[PDB]
Amino acid sequence: VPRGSTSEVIEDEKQFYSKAKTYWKQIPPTVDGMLGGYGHISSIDINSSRKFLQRFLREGPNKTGTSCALDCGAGIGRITKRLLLPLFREVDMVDITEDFLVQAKTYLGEEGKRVRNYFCCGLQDFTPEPDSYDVIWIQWVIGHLTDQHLAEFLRRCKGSLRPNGIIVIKDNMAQEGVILDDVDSSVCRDLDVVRRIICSAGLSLLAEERQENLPDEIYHVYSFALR
Amino acid sequence: SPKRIA
Ligand SMILES: Nc1ncnc2c1ncn2[C@@H]1O[C@H](CSCC[C@H](N)C(=O)O)[C@@H](O)[C@H]1O
């Protein structure tokens, strides 16, 4: 009954990507744009992400470093501004939408001078530098990749982590199956599907947490910390 | 983005 892979829901992969690019090209370069009309939840999100991340910053043998993070599907840099720049000496951003990266230079202000690379690339086409990032943060974008491209992107991210580095995925989760949104050209996957993909990429879960205090009407949101 | 359950 339920679909378990993107190959059951995507009619044409090239159109899946091209429609998403067109969709984001016509979104305003604002927090409300990044958050689909839910700009007001940004502080709830950031506070929770911060607490989640701080778990991994404690002193000890496995402490995650604080030299460099990578914000994936960063948009205008909502997460880079409020979560990552305060904690990491430098941050790189990657996003498909050039207009958002241009706006980021304004949005981020003076602290944005510590954004090193602004990569304008789809994740499916991006190979982060080996041994470069303490944290790779992937939020509200995995639904834009096919299962094969998401698994491969996660493998490339694994190869980019510094010692003790982590990947964080934070995204919408479906109650069951794999659900296409043909307006923004994305999919929403259930927790079993996402865990399968992570496993396929050679990654393991360090922690999984549901986001609390969200509007009742929206898809549930989870965070996963991986290595 | 965060979004309404379809
Ligand atoms: N295939 C792809 N590769 C990289 N970025 C993509 C992409 N498809 C969509 N995007 C980007 O994904 C972002 C989704 S909006 C969320 C922005 C940010 N993660 C935040 O939470 O504030 C947009 O900036 C859009 O340009």
Q: How many domains does chain A have?
A: 1
Distance CA A226, CA A150 (A): 14
CB-CB contact of A183 with B4 (8 Å)? no
Contacts of A217 in chain B (CB under 8 A): 4-5
Domain with A155 in it: what CATH number? Answer: 3.40.50.150
**Tokens 């990749």, residue located:** A145
Q: Give ∠ CA A66-A72-A77 in degrees, rounded to 5.
A: 80
A26 class by beta-carbon count within 10 Å (0-12 exposed, 13-18 middle, 19+ buried): exposed
Distance CA A157, CA A12 (A): 26
Distance CA A18, CA A14 (A): 6
**Which two tokens mark A79?**
């997460």
DSSP A5: S
Q: Which residues contact A62 (CB under 8 A, 6 or more apart)?
A: A56, A164
Rounded alpha-carbon distances, angstroms, from residue A42 to A11, A78, A92, A157, A189: 33, 8, 21, 26, 22
User: CB of A57 within 8 Å of any CB in chain B?
Assistant: no
Q: Which residues contact A63 (CB under 8 A, 6 or more apart)?
A: A56, A57, A164
Residue-by-residue DSSP string for A173-207:
EESSSEEEETTTTEEEEEHHHHHHHHHHTT--EEE
Distance CA A194, CA A215 (A): 23
Q: Which residues contact A52 (CB under 8 A, 6 or more apart)?
A: A168, A207, A209, A223, A225
Distance CA A40, CA A178 (A): 27
**Which two tokens mark A71?**
């914000």
Phi, psi (deg, nearest 5) at residue A178: -135, 115
CB-CB contact of A73 with A141 (8 Å)? yes
DSSP A67: S
**Which two tokens mark A224?**
């996963």
The experimental method is X-ray
The closest alpha carbon to A135, from A206, A43, A45, belongs to: A206
Q: Give ∠ CA A189-A29-A190 in degrees, rounded to 5.
A: 5
What is residue A63's three-state secondary structure?
coil
Helix axes A191-200, A147-160, angle to 10 degrees: 50
**Tokens 């984001």, residue located:** A24
Distance CA A74, CA A118 (A): 10
Smallest CA–CA distance, residue B1 to chain A, in Å, is 5
CB-CB contact of A72 with A136 (8 Å)? yes
CB-CB contact of A177 with A3 (8 Å)? yes
CB-CB contact of A104 with A112 (8 Å)? yes
Strand ranges for chain A from DSSP E: 68-72, 90-95, 115-120, 133-139, 161-174, 178-181, 186-190, 205-210, 220-226
The closest alpha carbon to A2, from A146, A178, A196, belongs to: A178
Contacts of B3 in chain A (CB under 8 A): 36, 38, 172, 181, 218-219
Interface test with B, best of A95, A170, A172 (most B CBs within 10 A): A172
Distance CA A95, CA A218 (A): 24
Residue A83: domain span: 1-227
Residues with CB under 6 A from ligand 1: A 20, 24, 34, 73-75, 78-79, 95-97, 100, 122-124, 139-141, 144; B 1
Q: What was the resolution (in A) of this experimentally determined structure?
A: 1.6
